[PDB]
Design a protein around this ligand. Structure first.
Ligand SMILES: [Cl-]
Ligand SMILES: [Cl-]
Ligand SMILES: [Mg+2]
Ligand SMILES: [Mg+2]
Ligand SMILES: [Mg+2]
Ligand SMILES: [Mg+2]
Length: 306
């Protein structure tokens, strides 16, 4: 555990841009994600009214509302000064979106570029659309991700197709997509040392995530005797991570447990993840207590730099 100096308060901002992004940010607010500022950005003013974000930005046109990523790109570039003033002061900025639409696809690279011009550690957390969303959205998402990769420090890409065996509604599918974008953000933020709780220093996260490039995520959860090892096993074998950990230059491990979380099982899960990663990889890990979990252990692995 490191706090240098122990009074340093890191400023973290989570931007949701477009429909999927604004929805994921609201899910983080509902789940009570702490220590971060929430920002919602959309071109559609009506789609911003239910957002509970701290700051809401309508980057659409005057006297009009509202598919095309170029429109999304132009809307964000035309509101560059407005986006800049809401990101000013951040040590770290997350850019989150559901790739495939107009606003998120086109707008997220502009948000990422503004965050980096302010020297923030800039992390993209996006989803690839579900197959049922169709070919055009999948095509637009792929061009959108290629654009965003060039404007962020690290880009976590989560395929929505690897989330959904029983039939789930479109509503349940989109609820699961919000939940996975929250896991991507919370995995990192919950570990960052705060003046009231010493854990992983912001400099350590920055050393792994800064200019790392592409990143993959794995999630796992277990109960019982070997709950920590079994959760870690599930995360390193997760369909979203597609077992590439051996290629990563850096690995971030987040262990979340109940009030009875012991140091021994934390270390067991830590060495299991370390054994799967490359010998020359930088491994940073943190553990946090969420009293609501009970006899459950949740593991999040982020493999960055390939
Ligand atoms: Cl807080
Ligand atoms: Cl206008
Ligand atoms: Mg708050
Ligand atoms: Mg609400
Ligand atoms: Mg305007
Ligand atoms: Mg923190």
């Amino acid at each position: 555990g490191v706090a240098a100096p122990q009074n340093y308060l890191a400023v973290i901002k989570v931007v949701g841009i477009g429909g999927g992004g604004v929805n994921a940010v609201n899910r983080m607010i509902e789940e009570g994600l702490k220590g971060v500022e929430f920002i919602a950005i959309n071109t559609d003013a009506q789609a911003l009214l239910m957002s509970d974000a701290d700051v809401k930005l309508d980057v659409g046109r005057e006297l009009t509302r509202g598919a095309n990523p170029d429109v999304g790109r132009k809307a964000a570039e035309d509101h560059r000064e407005e986006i800049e003033e809401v990101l000013k002061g951040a040590d770290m900025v997350f850019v989150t979106a559901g790739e495939g639409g107009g606003t998120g696809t086109g707008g997220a690279p502009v948000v990422a570029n503004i965050a980096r011009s302010l020297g923030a550690l800039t992390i993209g957390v996006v989803t690839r659309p579900f197959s049922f969303e169709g070919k055009r959205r999948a095509t637009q998402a792929e061009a959108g991700i290629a654009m965003l990769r060039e404007e962020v420090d690290t880009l976590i890409v989560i395929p929505n197709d690897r989330l959904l065996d029983r039939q789930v509604s479109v509503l349940d599918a989109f609820k699961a997509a919000d939940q996975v974008l929250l896991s991507g953000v919370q995995g990192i933020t919950d570990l960052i040392t705060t003046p009231g709780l010493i854990n992983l220093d912001f400099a350590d996260v920055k050393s792994v995530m800064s200019g790392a490039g592409s990143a993959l995520m794995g999630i796992g959860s277990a109960r019982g005797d070997d709950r920590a090892v079994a959760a870690a096993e599930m995360a390193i074998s997760s369909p979203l991570l597609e077992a590439s950990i051996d290629g990563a230059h850096g690995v971030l491990l987040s262990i979340q447990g109940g009030s009875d979380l012991g140091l021994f099982e934390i270390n067991e899960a830590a060495q299991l993840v370390a054994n799967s990663a490359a010998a020359e990889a930088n491994i940073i890990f943190g553990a946090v207590i969420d009293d609501a979990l009970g006899d459950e252990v949740r593991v999040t692995v982020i493999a960055a730099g390939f």
